[PDB]
Amino acid sequence: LWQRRQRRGEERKAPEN
Numbered sequence: 001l002w003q004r005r006q007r008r009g010e011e012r013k014a015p016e017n
């Protein structure tokens with residue numbers, strides 16, 4: 001679920017913020 005875009009500064013689940 002969470003913990004993937006922390007590595008991009010995007011945090012979590014969105015279809016591109």
Ligand SMILES: N#Cc1ccc2c(CN3CCOCC3)cc(-c3ccc([C@H]4CCC(=O)N4)cc3)nc2c1
Nearest residue numbers: 001002003004005008010011012013014015016017
């Ligand atoms: N929590 C969370 C979470 C969970 C899934 C996510 C998925 C789909 N999953 C499907 C399963 O395999 C890994 C991808 C895509 C994206 C995502 C895709 C592209 C970008 C664009 C714009 C920003 C950038 O650098 N790229 C930003 C965010 N963010 C997600 C965030």
